[PDB]
Amino acid sequence: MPVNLKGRSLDSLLNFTTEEVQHLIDLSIDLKKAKYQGLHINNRPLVGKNIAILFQKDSTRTRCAFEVAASDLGAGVTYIGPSGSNMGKKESIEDTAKVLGRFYDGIEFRGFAQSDVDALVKYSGVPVWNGLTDDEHPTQIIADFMTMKEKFGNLKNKKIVFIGDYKNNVGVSTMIGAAFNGMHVVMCGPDNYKNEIDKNVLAKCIELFKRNGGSLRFSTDKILAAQDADVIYTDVWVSLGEPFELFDKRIGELKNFQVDMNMIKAAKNDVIFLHCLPAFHDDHTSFSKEVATTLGAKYPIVAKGEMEVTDEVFQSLHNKAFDQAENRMHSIKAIILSTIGY
Amino acid sequence: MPVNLKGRSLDSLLNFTTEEVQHLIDLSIDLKKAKYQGLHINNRPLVGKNIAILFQKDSTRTRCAFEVAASDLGAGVTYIGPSGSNMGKKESIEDTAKVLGRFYDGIEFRGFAQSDVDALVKYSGVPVWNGLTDDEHPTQIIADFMTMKEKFGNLKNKKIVFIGDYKNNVGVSTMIGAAFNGMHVVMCGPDNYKNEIDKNVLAKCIELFKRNGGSLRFSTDKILAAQDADVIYTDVWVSLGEPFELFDKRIGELKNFQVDMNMIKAAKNDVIFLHCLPAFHDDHTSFSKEVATTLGAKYPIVAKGEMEVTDEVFQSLHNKAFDQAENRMHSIKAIILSTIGY
Amino acid sequence: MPVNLKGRSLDSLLNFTTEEVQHLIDLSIDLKKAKYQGLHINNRPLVGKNIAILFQKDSTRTRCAFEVAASDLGAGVTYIGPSGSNMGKKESIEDTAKVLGRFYDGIEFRGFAQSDVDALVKYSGVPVWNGLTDDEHPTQIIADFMTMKEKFGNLKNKKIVFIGDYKNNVGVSTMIGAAFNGMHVVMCGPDNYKNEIDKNVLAKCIELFKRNGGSLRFSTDKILAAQDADVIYTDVWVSLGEPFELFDKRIGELKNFQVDMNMIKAAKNDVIFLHCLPAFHDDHTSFSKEVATTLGAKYPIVAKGEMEVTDEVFQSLHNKAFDQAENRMHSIKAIILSTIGY
Amino acid sequence: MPVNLKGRSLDSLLNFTTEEVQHLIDLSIDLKKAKYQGLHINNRPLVGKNIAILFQKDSTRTRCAFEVAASDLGAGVTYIGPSGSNMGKKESIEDTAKVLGRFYDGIEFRGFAQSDVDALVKYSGVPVWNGLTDDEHPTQIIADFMTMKEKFGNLKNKKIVFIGDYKNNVGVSTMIGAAFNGMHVVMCGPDNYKNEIDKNVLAKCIELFKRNGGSLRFSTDKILAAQDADVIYTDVWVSLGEPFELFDKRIGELKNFQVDMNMIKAAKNDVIFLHCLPAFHDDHTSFSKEVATTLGAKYPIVAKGEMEVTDEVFQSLHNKAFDQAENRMHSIKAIILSTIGY
Amino acid sequence: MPVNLKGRSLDSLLNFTTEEVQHLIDLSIDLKKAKYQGLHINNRPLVGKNIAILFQKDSTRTRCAFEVAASDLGAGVTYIGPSGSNMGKKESIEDTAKVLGRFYDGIEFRGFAQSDVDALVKYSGVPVWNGLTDDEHPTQIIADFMTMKEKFGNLKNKKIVFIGDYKNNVGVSTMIGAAFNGMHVVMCGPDNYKNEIDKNVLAKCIELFKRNGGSLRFSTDKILAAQDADVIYTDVWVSLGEPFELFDKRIGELKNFQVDMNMIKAAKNDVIFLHCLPAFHDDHTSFSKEVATTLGAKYPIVAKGEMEVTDEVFQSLHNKAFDQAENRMHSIKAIILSTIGY
C-alpha cells in the first residue's frame, strides 16, 4: 500500500510503517538538497496555508526549525508561547483543539502530556505534530537518523550506543529510530533504568528489530558498549527545574557514563557523536560553573563543568551534533510537507 | 451615500451606519466562500502592507483570527503581547500611537480602556481595530450576526436571548448587533443588571430599533424569554483573576439563568446556541473542578462543573459556537480589507 | 576598495569607513523613496531568506523596525523575546551562535553585553546586527543622520548639540555619527560627564573629525551651545527600573539642561529637535506623574511632569523626532539589504 | 467538528454529517457562480494532480461531469471504459486498487457492486467517488438538492414526491437527500416496494428527519401524494433490458404511477419536475417505439411512447431536469475539490 | 559518447548502451523525488507537445503510466484503444505511421508484432516507445531495475532469479536488464525453454556480462537457484486463454516452479519478490477459481487459487511488486523526457 502520509498527525512514530519512516528521512535529505540550490524560492507549495505552533515550554531549536521550514514552504506561521499554550485550565483541550482546527491547516504542539497531543489529534481534524512530550520526540528522531544516513548510507546492521539517562524521552526515541532502521542498539548506563521503559514500546521495537534486522541489548560498561559502534549518542544528566538533592542522586548514578575520549577511540575510527543540545561540555555557562563548583569536589568528572561529555570529545572531528541540529529544520520540513501535502 | 469604510477605524460599532455593518456581515460571508474555493492563493490584495496587533492581555481567539486573516490577504503581521502593549506607563499613548502609524498600515489593539482605542484612532493616522475593551467587542459582533444570518437569512424581527451576566461587554455588544439587524433582544438575568448598562449606548440602540425593527426588553425568567427564540446566546459568569469571594456572589445571582435542555426545548425547534468561548460546560477544566468541588454542594447546578451552559446543550445539534469561532477570522478579514482597501 | 558590505555585521559603526556609512545613509533614503512609490510590492529581493531577531530586553521600536523592514524585502522573521534570548545560562553563546547560523541567513541581537554581539558575529558565520548594547546603538545612528540629511542636505560643517546625559550610549552614539558626517558636535551637560566617556572612542571620533571636518566641543551652558545649532538632540534623564537615590541625584545634576523654547530660540530658525523616544514632556505618563508628585517640589522643572524637554517644544514644528522614528525602519532595511545582498 | 472532507471518499452519503452535505451543496453553487465569471481561467487549484475515472458500464452524464469538473480545476483525467474497469476477474480488486493509488490522486468508480467501491476506498488510500452503484448515487443527490435549493432557497419542511420505481438506487438516494435537508418525502408507487428498501438506510433516514425536521411517507396514489408538493421526482420504469416480459410486469405494476399534467396540477402552482434522465417522454427514441409496439396494449399509456412522464409534462415550465443535469458537474467539482483539497 | 537519447526510440533496450540504460534508471529516481516535492507543478517542460498512446490490447498499468507521466510533464495525450490501434488491415502500417508523425511529437505502441514497432520507428520519424510486444518489454525493464537499485544500491554482482515461464517476453527482458546491470541471472524453469530463446539476444547478453560483470545460468531447481539470491522475479503461467488444456500442459510443465516461502527462505534474509502483476496468489479472482475447479487435480498446487506464487509469499515484507508498479510511471517519464527533450 502507498506511502500516503497526507492528513496524518505525527503523534508517535510507532504509529508509522517502516516504509513511511524511511520516506520521511529520504524526503528530508532531498528537501535539504533542494534548498542548497535555491529551489525553494520559486517553489513554495504551501502558499495559502497557515500552521500554528504551540509551546507549553520554550524550545528554541524546535520552534526555529518549524518557523523556518514552514516559511520556506510558503506557509504562514503563528507562534503561541507558554503564556498562551496552557491547556485544560481555563478551557477544555477538546474545545481548544476544535477551534484551532477552524483557523489552521496544521498544528504543532510541545507539552508534557502525550494525552494533550492525543486530544489535539482527535478533535482538530488537521495534521498535528508532536514537537516533544514526556513520552517521545518524533521530529528529532527523523533528524537524527537522517544525519546518520548521510554519514554511512543504509543503516541496517550498523551499531549505535545511547549512553547516559537512556530511560528518558530522547533515549527511548533513539531506540525507536534504531528499530525502524534495523540498527543494533546498546542502551548503556545504569541497570535499574531498563525497568522504567514502557513495556508496549519495547514489544513494538522488538518486532521492528525482527522485521528490519537490528538488536536491542542493554549494557552497564561504557567501554564494552562502544565496541564497533558507528554512533555514540548521549544527553544531559540533569533536567533544568529541580533540586540539587536530585542532582546529587542523578550525577551519582550516572557518573560512570560520561562520554570521553576513551569511549570514542574504544569505538570505530569513523564513529560519530550525537547530542540534541544544549550539552554541558565545559564551564562556559553559569549553570556549568555552578555545578562544577558545588559538586566539583564530591565528583571529579563535573569538576571542569563537563557532565555527559568531555569538551575534548565535543571539539573533536567526531562530533556531528551541529549537523544533527541543522537537520531538525529539513526533517520537520519533510513532516509538514508530506502531512499537509503539496 | 457610498459605503466607504476605507480609512475607518472599528473603534465602536455604534459609529457605523446600519448599511455599513450589513456590508461588513455580507463581505464576511463572501470572503469565506472565496476561501473555500482557494481564491486567496492567487488573489492577495494586501501584499506590501503590514499590521501590528497589540494585546495588553492574552486573547488566543482574536489573535489567531487576525493572524490568519491578514496572512491570507498577503499582509505582514507583528504580534505584540502583554509585555509590549503597555500604554501611559513608560510613554504617553498619544506618542506611541504616532510611532506605530509610521511603521504599519493598520493597528489592532485589545486592552481594558476604550479611551486607549480612541487615542490610537486619533493619533495613529491609520485604521485601528478594537480587539476588545471593557466597553465593547466589535469584531465579535460581526462574527456573531454573520453566523445567525448564515443560518437564518434576513434577521429582521427574529428573536435572540442573551442570558446571564448580560451587562458585560459581550451582552452589551450583542444588544448593539441586535439593534443593527432589526432583531428582538431579550436581555435575560438579574433585574438590577440593567442599571449597569451605559445610558448613551442604550439610547443609540433604542434609536436603531425604531429604525431597523425589533425591540429591547429585559426578562428575569429564562423559560419565558426563550419562548419563540431563534437564538440563545450566553457567556461566562466569572472574570478570571477576580477574587473568588466575588465569584460566589455572582453565581448566587445567576444560579437561575443556566442554559439547559429545558430552555432550548422551550424555544423554537430550530433554535441555535451561541457562546463566544471558552465556556464552562463540563469538568474538563481545572477551574471547572474547583468550582464543582468548593461550590458544588451549595449550588448543585455546578456540581458537574457546568455553569452558564450544561454539557447536554453544549453537545447538541443546537450549538453553533464553533462556526461562530470560525467566523471570527472571516469577519475580521472583511474588516481589515474594507478598512485598508484593495 | 568598494562598499562591499555584503556579509558584514553591524557590530559597531566604528568598524566601518566614512564612505560605507554615507552609503548606508544614502541607500536608506533611496529605499524610503521606493516604498512610497509602492516599488516594494513586486520587488522583494530576500524571498527565500529568513532572519532571527533576538531581544533580551523588550525594545518595541527596534523590533517593529526589523519586522517591517524584513517583511517588505520578502524575508521571513522569527522574533525571540527575553525568555528565549538568554546567553550563557544553560548553553554557551558559542554553541547557540553555531545553530542559529544553520537556520538563519541573518541575526539581529539586542542585549547589554557587546561581547555577546562579538560572539555571535564570530560563531554564526552570517551577518549579525547590533539592535542595542550598553556600548552602542548603530541602527539608531543611521536613522538619526539620515533624518538630518533629509532636512539639511550635505551635513559637513553643520552644528548639532547633544544635550543632557551626553555620556550615555545614545549621546555617545550621536557623537560617533556626527564625526562620520563631519559635523560640529557640542556635548552639553554637567562638566564631569565627559570624563566618563571611553577614551578610545574619543580617539577614533577625533580622527574622524580630522578627516571629515566638523569638531567636538564640551559645554555647560545650553543657550550658548545652542548658538547657530542646526540640530538639538536630547534623551531621558532616567534609567527605568533604576532606584531613587540615583534618580534624584540625576535630576539634580541635570536640572539646567532641559531643552526649552528659549534654547530653541537661541538656535538657528531652522533648528530641528531630535529625541530617540520615549520622551517625558508632559504628565501623560504614570511614571512622569510620580516624578511631578514626589520631586516636583524640590525641582519645579519637573513639576509639570516634563524633564529633558518641555511640552511646548515637543508640540512645536521643530520636533522631527517622529520622522526620526519612521527612519528607524528605512535605515534598518538598508542594513539588511547591503549586508544580506539582493 | 470542522467541515473538513479533505481525504474523504464519497462512498455513501450516509457516511457524512448534515453539515458536510450542506457544505457540499453550498460550495457547488459558489463554484457555478465562479465559473460564470471566468474565475477558473486563472485560478486552477489542482494543477499537478491526476484522477482516474472508471466506468464498468457507460454513463455519459456522469463521465462528462467528472471530465469538465477536473479539467476546470486543472487536473489531468484518465478515462477507463467498461473493458478496462473490470474488477475481480483478471486481478483481485484489492490488488488493482493498490496500484491505482500509486498513480492517481483520486479515483471515481461507476459499477454495480457497492462492495467494489468499499475495496477501492480501503485499498487505494486516496479519495474515491461513487459514480453510481446498485445501492446509491451520491454525486446525483448533491446535484438534485442543489437544484432544489437554487429554486426554493432553504429546503427545510418542503415537500418532495418520489414516484415510480421508488425502491431503486435513485429513489433511495432522493430519500437520503430529503432527510439531510429536513424535507417531507413521499415515496409513491407499488405498495410492496417499501419492503425491498434496506432497513438500515431507513433507520438512518428516520434519525436525520428527527434532527433536520422532515418526514417519510408511503403513498399508492399519485394525486393524494402531490398535495402541496414543491418537487415531483421520477425515473424510468425500464432499465434495458432483461426481456420484454419483465417490462410487461413492470409497466404492469407501474402503469398507474405515470407523471402527467393531472399530478402537476394537483401539486403546487410553483412545483418543479426533476428527472435524472434520460427520460422516456415520447417516441423520438427507438427503444421507446419498440415499447409502444410490443405493449401499446395491454397498457394504453405506453402506446404513444411516453412512460414515466408525459411529453406534455416534460415540456412545461415545470421541468428543471436540464438544470439538474448541468448541476451534475458543478457538484462533482465541489466533491473533487473538497476531497482533494486546494 | 554523450548520453543523448534525444530523438531516440525505445524499440528494444538492446539498442542502447550500458551508460544510457543507467542514465534512464537514475533519472527515473530523480524524477520520483522531484514529484514528491511538488516540483512538477511549476516546472512542466513538455507544454506545447502531444503524444499518442496506442494499445492493440488493453494494458491498464502501461497506459496509466504513460498518462500520468505525460500529464505531469505538461504534454497532451491521445489514448487509442484496440479498435483504433489496428495496423495493417484497413491501411498499411507504413501509411498510418507517416500520419501520426505529422500530428504527434511522440508515439507509444503496445501490440504483438515487434515488426510493427520497427515500422513506426522508421516511418513516423518521431520517438516511438515499445509498450510491450511478444519480444520485449523495455519500459518494464527500467522500472524493475530501478526498483532493485532503490533497495540495494549499486546492483553489480547481485543475484536475481527469474523463475517460471522464463522464455516469454518478461523473462528475456529481465535477463536483458540483468546484463546491463552486471548481475548474476538465474533463469529457472522447464529445461527446454532455453531453446526457445532468441540466440542473438543471448549473444548480446553474454557480451554485456563480459563488460558489466554478471553471468547467465539455467536452473531446473527452485531451491538450488534461490541460493544467495537478492531478487526473485516471477510471472503468470497462464496468459488467458487458449483453452483450459494448454493450461493443463502449462501448469503441467510449470507445477514444480511455484514461488513459495520455502524458496524465499532458501534465499536471503534480505531478498525481495518482484512480479509485473497481475499476479494469481489467491482465489479472489474468478479466473483463478475456474482454475482451482477445472484443475485442482491433477495439480494440487493450483487447487487453492495460487499459481506462480503463494498468497503466503505475496503478503510478506518481501513483496515489492507495488513499488515496482508505481515505478512503471516514474521510468516512463524519464523515457518520455529524455527522448523528447526539455
Task: Give dist(CA D133, CA D111) in Å, integer.
Answer: 5
Task: Give dist(CA C171, CA C202) in Å, integer.
Answer: 12
E326 touches D at CB < 8 Å: yes
Task: Give dist(CA A285, CA E160) in Å, integer.
Answer: 58
Q: Which of D153, D154, D342 sits opposite B38 (nearest CB)?
A: D342
> Residue B40 is placed in which grid cell?
486567496
With b for 16 or more beta-carbon neighbours within 10 A and e for fewer, the D238-273 pattern comes to beeeeeeeebeebbebbbebbbeeebbebbbeebbb
B64 is in an annotated binding site: no
Identify the helix (H) or strand (E) that includes residue D263.
helix D261-266
Q: Which residues of B touch C277 (CB under 8 A)?
A: 91, 95, 99
Task: Give dist(CA C121, CA A44) in Å, integer.
Answer: 30
Fold of D1-152+321-342: Rossmann fold (3.40.50)
Which one of the listed residues E140, E250, E275, E324 is annotated catalytic?
Answer: E140
B78 vs C61: CB contact, 8 Å cut-off? no
Per the CB < 8 A criterion, the answer to whether D194 and D225 are in contact is: no
Task: Give dist(CA E161, CA E151) in Å, integer.
Answer: 16
Task: Give dist(CA E166, CA E182) in Å, integer.
Answer: 19
Per the CB < 8 A criterion, the answer to whether B305 and B283 are in contact is: yes
Which one of the listed residues D235, D258, D281, D318 is annotated catalytic?
Answer: D235
> Residue C272 is placed in which grid cell?
530641528
Q: Torsion-angle region of residue E92: left (phi > 0), alpha (psi -120 to 50) or beta? A: beta
Region(s) of chain C under CATH 3.40.50.1370: 1-152+321-342, 153-320
E with C: touching (≥3 Cβ pairs within 8 Å) = no
CA-CA distances (angstroms) from residue E88 to B296, D326, E82, E102, E122? 91, 43, 13, 19, 15
C95 vs A326: CB contact, 8 Å cut-off? no
Per the CB < 8 A criterion, the answer to whether A9 and A121 are in contact is: yes
> Residue A94 is placed in which grid cell?
477538546
Q: What is the resolution of this structure in A?
A: 2.6
With b for 16 or more beta-carbon neighbours within 10 A and e for fewer, the E116-137 pattern comes to bbbbbbebbebbbbbbbbebbb
Task: Give dist(CA C205, CA A224) in Å, integer.
Answer: 64
With b for 16 or more beta-carbon neighbours within 10 A and e for fewer, the D288-324 pattern comes to beebbeebeeebebbeebbbbbbeebbeeebbbbeeb
3-state secondary structure of D130: strand
Task: Give dist(CA E113, CA E118) in Å, integer.
Answer: 9
Mutation target to probe the D interface, by most D beta carbons within 10 A, among E40, E41, E61, E64 is E64
Those residues whose C-beta lies under 8 Å from the C-beta of residue A77, and which sit 6 or more positions away, are: A50, A51, A52, A53, A66, A67, A70, A71
Nearest alpha carbon to residue A260 among A295, A216, A225 = A225
CA angle B178, B182, B187 (to 5 degrees): 35
Task: Give dist(CA B121, CA B8) in Å, integer.
Answer: 9
Amino acid (one-letter) located at D102: R
Q: Torsion-angle region of residue B108: left (phi > 0), alpha (psi -120 to 50) or beta? A: beta
Query: How close is the nearest chain E Cα to the Cα of A342, in Å?
Result: 6
> Residue A242 is placed in which grid cell?
529541580
> Residue D120 is placed in which grid cell?
477501492
E71 touches D at CB < 8 Å: yes
Strand partners, B185: B160, B216
In total, chain E counts a number of residues equal to: 342
B with E: touching (≥3 Cβ pairs within 8 Å) = no
The sheet with strand E76-80 has its strands ordered as E76-80, E50-55, E106-110, E128-132
Task: Give dist(CA E72, CA E66) in Å, integer.
Answer: 10
D50 vs E40: CB contact, 8 Å cut-off? no
Task: Give dist(CA D297, CA D311) in Å, integer.
Answer: 19
> Residue B129 is placed in which grid cell?
481595530
Q: Which of the other chains make 3 or more beta carbon contacts under 8 angstroms with chain D?
A: A, B, E
> Residue E36 is placed in which grid cell?
514528491
Task: Give dist(CA B83, CA B86) in Å, integer.
Answer: 7
For residue C194, count other CB atoms closer than 10 A to its CB: 14
Those residues whose C-beta lies under 8 Å from the C-beta of residue E201, and which sit 6 or more positions away, are: E14, E172, E175, E176
Task: Give dist(CA E12, CA E30) in Å, integer.
Answer: 23
Instruction: Give the sign of the dihedral formed by CA C279, CA C280, CA C286, CA C288.
Output: positive
A93 vs B63: CB contact, 8 Å cut-off? no
> Residue A146 is placed in which grid cell?
537522517
Query: How close is the nearest chain C Cα to the Cα of B113, in Å?
Result: 15
Which one of the listed residues E275, E318, E328, E330 is annotated catalytic?
Answer: E328
Those residues whose C-beta lies under 8 Å from the C-beta of residue A213, and which sit 6 or more positions away, are: A156, A157, A182, E269
N- to C-terminal Cα separation, chain E: 20
Query: How close is the nearest chain D Cα to the Cα of B183, in Å?
Result: 20
Give the phi and the psi of residue C15 in degrees, each rounded to 5: -90, 20
Fold of A153-320: Rossmann fold (3.40.50)
Those residues whose C-beta lies under 8 Å from the C-beta of residue E3, and which sit 6 or more positions away, are: E17, E19, E20, E23
B36 vs D45: CB contact, 8 Å cut-off? no
E40 touches D at CB < 8 Å: yes
A50 vs B68: CB contact, 8 Å cut-off? yes
Q: Which residues of A touch C78 (CB under 8 A)?
A: 63-64, 67-68, 79
For residue B119, count other CB atoms closer than 10 A to its CB: 22
For residue C199, count other CB atoms closer than 10 A to its CB: 8
DSSP assignment of A113-153 equals: -HHHHHHHHHHH-S-EEEEE-SS--HHHHHHHHHHHHHHHS
Report the 3 state secondary structure along chain E.
CCCCCCCCCECCHHHCCHHHHHHHHHHHHHHHHHHHCCCCCCCCCCCCCEEEEEECCCCHHHHHHHHHHHHHHCCEEEEECCCCCCCCCCCCHHHHHHHHHHHCCEEEEECCCHHHHHHHHHHHCCCEEEEECCCCCHHHHHHHHHHHHHHHCCCCCCEEEEECCCCCHHHHHHHHHHHHCCCEEEEECCHHHHHCCCHHHHHHHHHHHHHHCCECCEECCHHHHCCCCCEEEECCCCCCCCCCCHHHHHHHHHCCCCECHHHHHHCCCCCEEEECCCCCCCCCCHHHHHHHHHHCCCCCHHHHCCCCECHHHHCCCCECHHHHHHHHHHHHHHHHHHHHCC
Query: How close is the nearest chain A Cα to the Cα of D239, in Å?
Result: 38
Give the phi and the psi of residue B132 in degrees, each rounded to 5: 150, 130
Per the CB < 8 A criterion, the answer to whether E287 and D90 are in contact is: yes
Q: Which of the other chains make 3 or more beta carbon contacts under 8 angstroms with chain A?
A: B, C, D, E
3-state secondary structure of A211: helix
B276 is in an annotated binding site: yes
Q: Which of B153, B322, B326 sits opposite D154 (nearest CB)?
A: B153
Q: Which of E33, E42, E322 sits opposite A43 (nearest CB)?
A: E42
Residue for cell digits 418537487?
Answer: D231
Task: Give dist(CA D236, CA D275) in Å, integer.
Answer: 9
Per the CB < 8 A criterion, the answer to whether E226 and E266 are in contact is: yes
DSSP code of residue C208: H
Q: Which of E33, E38, E317 sits opposite A45 (nearest CB)?
A: E38
DSSP assignment of D177-246 equals: HHHHTTPEEEEES-GGGGGSS-HHHHHHHHHHHHHH--B--EES-HHHHTTT-SEEEE--S--TTS-SSH
Per the CB < 8 A criterion, the answer to whether A218 and A186 are in contact is: yes
Q: Which segments within chain B are labelled E, that is strand?
A: 50-55, 76-80, 106-110, 128-132, 159-163, 184-188, 215-219, 231-234, 272-275
3-state secondary structure of A30: helix
Those residues whose C-beta lies under 8 Å from the C-beta of residue E311, and which sit 6 or more positions away, are: E281, E282, E305
Give the phi and the psi of residue C19 in degrees, each rounded to 5: -65, -40
Per the CB < 8 A criterion, the answer to whether A312 and A260 are in contact is: yes
Residue for cell digits 524519464?
Answer: E334
E39 vs A43: CB contact, 8 Å cut-off? yes
Give the phi and the psi of residue B231 in degrees, each rounded to 5: -130, 135
Give the phi and the psi of residue C125 in degrees, each rounded to 5: 65, 30
Strand partners, E308: none
Are β-strands A272-274 and A231-233 bridged in parallel, bridged antiparallel, or unpaired?
parallel
C67 vs B76: CB contact, 8 Å cut-off? yes
> Residue D276 is placed in which grid cell?
435524472
Nearest alpha carbon to residue C264 among C225, C219, C295 = C225
Amino acid (one-letter) located at C30: D
Task: Give dist(CA D218, CA C133) in Å, integer.
Answer: 84
B33 vs D31: CB contact, 8 Å cut-off? no
Active site residue D140: yes
A322 touches D at CB < 8 Å: no
CA-CA distances (angstroms) from residue B229 to A133, B183, B319, C252? 46, 11, 14, 69
Query: How close is the nearest chain D Cα to the Cα of B271, in Å?
Result: 12
Give the phi and the psi of residue A260 in degrees, each rounded to 5: -140, 170
DSSP code of residue B121: H
Per the CB < 8 A criterion, the answer to whether B339 and B106 are in contact is: yes
Amino acid (one-letter) located at E339: T
> Residue E80 is placed in which grid cell?
487509442
A233 touches B at CB < 8 Å: no
Give the phi and the psi of residue E340 in degrees, each rounded to 5: -85, -35
D with C: touching (≥3 Cβ pairs within 8 Å) = no
DSSP assignment of A288-309 equals: HHHHHHHSTTT-SGGGGS-SSB
Per the CB < 8 A criterion, the answer to whether D197 and D133 are in contact is: no
Active site residue C110: yes
Q: Which of C94, C98, C103 sits opposite A65 (nearest CB)?
A: C103
> Residue D341 is placed in which grid cell?
483539497
Strand partners, C161: C186, C232
How many Cβ pairs closer than 8 A exist between chain B and D?
37
**What proportions of chain C, in percent to the nearest 5, are helix, strand and coil?**
45, 15, 35
Task: Give dist(CA D135, CA A97) in Å, integer.
Answer: 37
B316 touches C at CB < 8 Å: no
Q: Compute CA E40 distance to the chain's CA centroid, rounded to the nearest angstrom.
A: 26
> Residue B158 is placed in which grid cell?
427574529
Query: Is residue B282 classed exposed, middle or buried when 0-12, 13-18 and 19+ CB atoms within 10 A define those classes?
Result: buried
Give the phi and the psi of residue A215 in degrees, each rounded to 5: -155, 155
Identify the helix (H) or strand (E) that includes residue C110.
strand C106-110
CA angle E247, E252, E258 (to 5 degrees): 95
For residue C184, how many C-alpha atoms fall within 13 Å in the half-sphere facing its CB? 10
Active site residues per annotation of B? 110, 137, 140, 235, 276, 328
Q: Which of E33, E43, E269 sits opposite A30 (nearest CB)?
A: E33
B278 touches A at CB < 8 Å: yes
B154 touches D at CB < 8 Å: no
> Residue E332 is placed in which grid cell?
516512463
E165 touches D at CB < 8 Å: no
Q: Which of the other chains make 3 or more beta carbon contacts under 8 angstroms with chain C?
A: A, B
Task: Give dist(CA C168, CA C136) in Å, integer.
Answer: 9
N- to C-terminal Cα separation, chain B: 20
Per the CB < 8 A criterion, the answer to whether B109 and B301 are in contact is: no
A1 touches D at CB < 8 Å: yes
> Residue A243 is placed in which grid cell?
533540586
> Residue D261 is placed in which grid cell?
399534467
Residue for cell digits 557514563?
Answer: A257
Task: Give dist(CA E15, CA E145) in Å, integer.
Answer: 17
Per the CB < 8 A criterion, the answer to whether B259 and B234 are in contact is: yes
N- to C-terminal Cα separation, chain A: 20
For residue D140, how many C-alpha atoms fall within 13 Å in the half-sphere facing its CB? 27
Residue ranges of the binding site of D:
59-62, 83, 110, 137-140, 169, 235, 239-240, 276-277, 328
Report the 3 state secondary structure along E29-72.
HHHHHHHHCCCCCCCCCCCCCEEEEEECCCCHHHHHHHHHHHHH
Active site residue C8: no
For residue C122, count other CB atoms closer than 10 A to its CB: 14
E285 vs D88: CB contact, 8 Å cut-off? yes
Q: Which of E41, E43, E153 sits opposite A45 (nearest CB)?
A: E41
For residue A315, count other CB atoms closer than 10 A to its CB: 11
Q: Which residues of B touch A80 (CB under 8 A)?
A: 60
D102 touches A at CB < 8 Å: yes
CA angle B14, B20, B22 (to 5 degrees): 100
